[PDB]
From Swiss-Prot, chain A:
It is found in: Cell membrane. Residues 31-34 are annotated as: Interaction with CSK. Interacts with NHERF1/EBP50. In resting T-cells, part of a PAG1-NHERF1-MSN complex which is disrupted upon TCR activation. When phosphorylated, interacts with CSK. Identified in a complex with LYN and STAT3. Interacts with LYN. The gene is Pag1. The chain holds residues 288 to 321 of 424 of the full protein. This is Phosphoprotein associated with glycosphingolipid-enriched microdomains 1. Negatively regulates TCR (T-cell antigen receptor)-mediated signaling in T-cells and FCER1 (high affinity immunoglobulin epsilon receptor)-mediated signaling in mast cells. Promotes CSK activation and recruitment to lipid rafts, which results in LCK inhibition. Inhibits immunological synapse formation by preventing dynamic arrangement of lipid raft proteins. May be involved in cell adhesion signaling. Ubiquitously expressed, with highest levels in developing brain, lung, thymus, spleen and testis. Present in mast cells. Changing residue 31 to F: Abolishes interaction with CSK. It comes from Rattus norvegicus (Rat).
UniProtKB/Swiss-Prot annotation, chain B:
The chain holds residues 80 to 173 of 450 of the full protein. It is found in: Cytoplasm; Cell membrane. It comes from Rattus norvegicus. Residues 8-97 form the SH2 domain. Homodimer (via SH3-domain). Interacts with PTPN22. Interacts with phosphorylated SIT1, PAG1, LIME1 and TGFB1I1; these interactions serve to recruit CSK to the membrane where it can phosphorylate and inhibit Src-family kinases. Interacts with SRCIN1. Interacts with RHOH. Interacts (via SH2 domain) with SCIMP; this interaction is dependent on phosphorylation of SCIMP 'Tyr-96'. Interacts (via SH2 domain) with PRAG1 (when phosphorylated at 'Tyr-391'); this interaction prevents translocation of CSK from the cytoplasm to the membrane leading to increased activity of CSK. Interacts with LRRK1. Autophosphorylated. Enriched in lymphoid tissues. It comes from the Eukaryota. The architecture of this protein is similar to that of Src-family kinases (SFKs) with one N-terminal SH3 domain, one SH2 domain, and a C-terminal kinase domain. This is Tyrosine-protein kinase CSK. Non-receptor tyrosine-protein kinase that plays an important role in the regulation of cell growth, differentiation, migration and immune response. Phosphorylates tyrosine residues located in the C-terminal tails of Src-family kinases (SFKs) including LCK, SRC, HCK, FYN, LYN, CSK or YES1. Upon tail phosphorylation, Src-family members engage in intramolecular interactions between the phosphotyrosine tail and the SH2 domain that result in an inactive conformation. Belongs to the protein kinase superfamily. Tyr protein kinase family. CSK subfamily.
Length: 38, 99
């Protein structure tokens, strides 16, 4: 149980081929989308 | 090439293929592939410090757009913009994921 002072967020993408039970909520949850600086 | 010189566009890649492809962390490595979860659109995968960022590409009226504000006429010009500047990307494009 370390302090946890690290900046990093993985990303496990999944296609309908392996998980056809995925909805816009799940699919989109695996995206970052346009995020301009600031 | 298929229709010019757009190797970065696989137009046919899975999650396992896209994951391994972006194994080595290198800001500037991007790749486009037909959206599996969403048929008819494309998805741009970039490697940011080892992280794989997926950008959904909406294709409507023969125009592409990810921010729903900047529409293009093709994927070629679209990448050119994201390559010259972030435009909403964790890291501007530098080297296309050649296949």
């Amino acid at each position: 149980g370390p302090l946890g002072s690290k900046r990093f967020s993985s990303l496990s993408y999944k296609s309908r081929e392996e998980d056809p039970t995925l909805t816009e909520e799940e699919i989109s949850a695996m995206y970052s989308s346009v995020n301009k600086p600031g | 090439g298929p229709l010019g010189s757009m190797p970065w566009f696989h137009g046919k890649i899975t999650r396992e293929q896209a994951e391994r492809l972006l194994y080595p962390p290198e800001t500037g490595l991007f790749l486009v592939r037909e959206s599996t979860n969403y048929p008819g659109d494309y998805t741009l995968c970039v490697s940011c410090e080892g992280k794989v960022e997926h950008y959904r590409i909406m294709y409507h009226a023969s125009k592409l757009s990810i921010d729903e504000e900047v529409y293009f006429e093709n994927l070629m010009q679209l990448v050119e913009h994201y390559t010259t500047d972030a435009d909403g990307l964790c890291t501007r494009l530098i080297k296309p994921k050649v296949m």
